[PDB]
Amino acid sequence: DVKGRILDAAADAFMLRGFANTTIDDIADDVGATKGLIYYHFRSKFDIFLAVYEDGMRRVRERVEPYVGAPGTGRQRLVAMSVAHVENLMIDLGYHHVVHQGVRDQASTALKVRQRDALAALNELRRDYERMFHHVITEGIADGSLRNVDDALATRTLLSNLNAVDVWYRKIEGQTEKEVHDLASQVVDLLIGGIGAT
Amino acid sequence: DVKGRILDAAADAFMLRGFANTTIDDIADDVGATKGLIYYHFRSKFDIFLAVYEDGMRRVRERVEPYVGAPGTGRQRLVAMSVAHVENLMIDLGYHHVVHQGVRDQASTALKVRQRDALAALNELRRDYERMFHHVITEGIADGSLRNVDDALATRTLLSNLNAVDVWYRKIEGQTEKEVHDLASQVVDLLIGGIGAT
């Protein structure tokens, strides 16, 4: 509900000014409320970080998991999973940064165990997500619709390639859903299809 | 000669701790020297970061540029350039981090003309490095060794994929130069040839 509004503006502020130099007041300014309502909804600043991670990891999974069991060859579901994964990134950049800057928070010596208890639990959520891609890649290797490559290395490589889109992608003012979807499909075409000729 | 020892130490400390959480103190401990030694060869912590960036650009360009004019189709030279880039990434991991940590020292206080001038200067070195790959990609497309894709999108996609090896790759001690070369060849096979079959 109205936490969703806080999670977005928190993720975006987390992405722009950094977790370290963003404060609960800064989210209060962005969300247009007082320091009260934020602290009503999450325990602490690190709780919003955890919540954006958790929510953003749920967003990408509800969008990608439906294709794991769908019909089609392995390559065909992998393509659909990837376009979804890239499209999630370009639409929800703030969530994507907090998810993959959960190490930027790890850069400071891991302080609270009862927090590194939830952050590690969250890491397992990202682990499970990547397992979906490993499963389809394995299936696509066996059904011939992918190359006989190393299943582990191809999974690491592909997922890092999908998350690397944020290196050069910017939110263009006025890009439509269709345009973003099409650009994600262009990107996935180079990732799955390669750039060399055959 | 000996400055290189401080550059090695700052690159790795900037990688693990992060730029902000490393001080001139730790670099001195890490080289086995006093703070005064570092303040000899560099005015400021940022100027070290500047020197690590500059040495990171020189190392990778020296390793990769020879393959630009080597014999081969555009694909063959793109492959050779890319392996050397990834080899340099795996071998000089701290330097690579700093060369692309730059995004984190751009969002921070862009403050001094004497320094921000030099930081933007390094980004043109980087931009000019990334133009070497763009030019080879354009040739590879024109000579049929690469699929007829968007040469600008493929350049951004490829370079970000090559630089994303650092998501999952860790220096494993005892790993030889040959093993790094083999692993980098494996990665580049996937970036150039895709995972898709047929």
Side-chain angles (χ1 to χ4, degrees), chain A residues 2-4 6-16 18-100 102-103 105 107 109-114 117-170 172-198, chain B residues 2-16 18-102 105 107-111 113 116-198:
Chain A
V2 326
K3 18 182 197 157
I6 291 163
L7 291 181
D8 314 330
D12 298 346
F14 274 24
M15 156 170 76
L16 317 189
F19 175 67
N21 305 34
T22 299
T23 198
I24 304 101
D25 280 288
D26 284 329
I27 298 149
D29 295 273
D30 299 3
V31 81
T34 55
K35 195 168 196 99
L37 206 184
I38 288 162
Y39 268 115
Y40 173 6
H41 263 306
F42 318 99
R43 223 193 328 192
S44 76
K45 195 225 267 162
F46 186 63
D47 261 41
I48 309 92
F49 186 80
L50 285 178
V52 169
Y53 191 134
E54 163 131 46
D55 200 34
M57 203 59 38
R58 180 202 46 75
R59 292 188 190 220
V60 79
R61 173 154 197 132
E62 288 179 23
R63 307 275 336 270
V64 177
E65 216 167 18
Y67 311 104
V68 153
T73 79
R75 173 191 190 160
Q76 267 155 5
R77 299 171 278 141
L78 187 58
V79 165
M81 285 162 75
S82 299
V83 172
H85 179 111
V86 174
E87 203 173 344
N88 179 71
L89 180 155
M90 322 164 141
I91 286 195
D92 286 316
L93 256 193
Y95 285 100
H96 178 269
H97 175 299
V98 152
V99 159
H100 299 99
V103 290
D105 214 356
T109 327
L111 73 187
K112 167 165 309 182
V113 175
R114 250 184 309 123
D117 168 326
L119 200 134
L122 289 186
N123 282 19
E124 210 74 48
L125 266 198
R126 195 138 56 91
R127 214 74 151 130
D128 271 327
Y129 178 85
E130 316 217 338
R131 232 177 303 282
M132 278 177 328
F133 283 80
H134 182 263
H135 181 90
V136 166
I137 288 161
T138 288
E139 290 202 315
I141 282 161
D143 77 20
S145 58
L146 301 175
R147 308 169 47 203
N148 190 336
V149 296
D150 188 76
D151 49 294
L153 181 63
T155 300
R156 261 168 217 115
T157 297
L158 168 78
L159 289 155
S160 74
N161 289 182
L162 299 165
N163 304 315
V165 165
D166 73 329
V167 174
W168 60 266
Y169 178 84
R170 311 264 97 89
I172 293 205
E173 161 157 13
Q175 273 222 307
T176 60
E177 225 153 292
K178 193 199 191 271
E179 276 169 298
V180 167
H181 174 78
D182 289 338
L183 182 59
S185 286
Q186 275 185 265
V187 171
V188 164
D189 178 57
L190 304 163
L191 303 192
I192 291 322
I195 169 153
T198 41
Chain B
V2 179
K3 226 167 63 183
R5 270 146 218 161
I6 305 80
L7 286 214
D8 293 336
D12 276 14
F14 291 164
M15 171 167 78
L16 290 324
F19 167 66
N21 329 116
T22 325
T23 168
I24 284 284
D25 306 69
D26 322 75
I27 308 185
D29 309 47
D30 293 350
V31 288
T34 88
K35 265 220 236 149
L37 159 62
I38 316 295
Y39 277 116
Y40 187 30
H41 314 248
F42 304 97
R43 326 194 283 219
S44 92
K45 147 190 276 192
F46 183 68
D47 303 296
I48 295 177
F49 174 97
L50 265 190
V52 169
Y53 191 158
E54 188 175 86
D55 217 44
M57 272 339 273
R58 171 203 63 96
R59 279 148 183 233
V60 68
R61 173 150 204 141
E62 256 156 44
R63 212 215 192 80
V64 162
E65 216 173 8
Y67 298 97
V68 181
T73 66
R75 176 191 180 137
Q76 301 173 294
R77 295 138 57 218
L78 189 57
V79 167
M81 288 153 85
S82 297
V83 161
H85 179 117
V86 167
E87 264 179 317
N88 169 271
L89 177 157
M90 288 164 173
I91 284 170
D92 280 334
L93 200 41
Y95 285 87
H96 172 265
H97 177 283
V98 161
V99 167
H100 304 75
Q101 169 152 37
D105 281 49
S108 92
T109 77
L111 41 81
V113 284
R116 175 37 196 215
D117 274 3
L119 179 85
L122 291 186
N123 297 335
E124 265 301 306
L125 284 185
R126 208 186 45 217
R127 211 63 103 169
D128 257 326
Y129 176 95
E130 326 221 321
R131 225 165 288 144
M132 273 192 314
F133 286 76
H134 192 302
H135 173 55
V136 164
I137 284 156
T138 301
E139 286 169 0
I141 298 193
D143 77 17
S145 53
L146 306 175
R147 308 162 44 195
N148 200 347
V149 302
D150 176 302
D151 56 76
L153 172 65
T155 302
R156 280 181 202 109
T157 292
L158 172 71
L159 278 167
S160 73
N161 296 345
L162 302 162
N163 288 321
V165 170
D166 91 280
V167 152
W168 56 267
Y169 174 89
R170 316 288 181 259
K171 312 142 307 304
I172 290 329
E173 246 311 3
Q175 193 146 225
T176 174
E177 268 182 56
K178 175 189 161 80
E179 266 168 322
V180 168
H181 173 81
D182 293 337
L183 184 55
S185 299
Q186 277 192 268
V187 170
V188 170
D189 180 59
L190 296 163
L191 303 193
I192 303 279
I195 313 148
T198 261

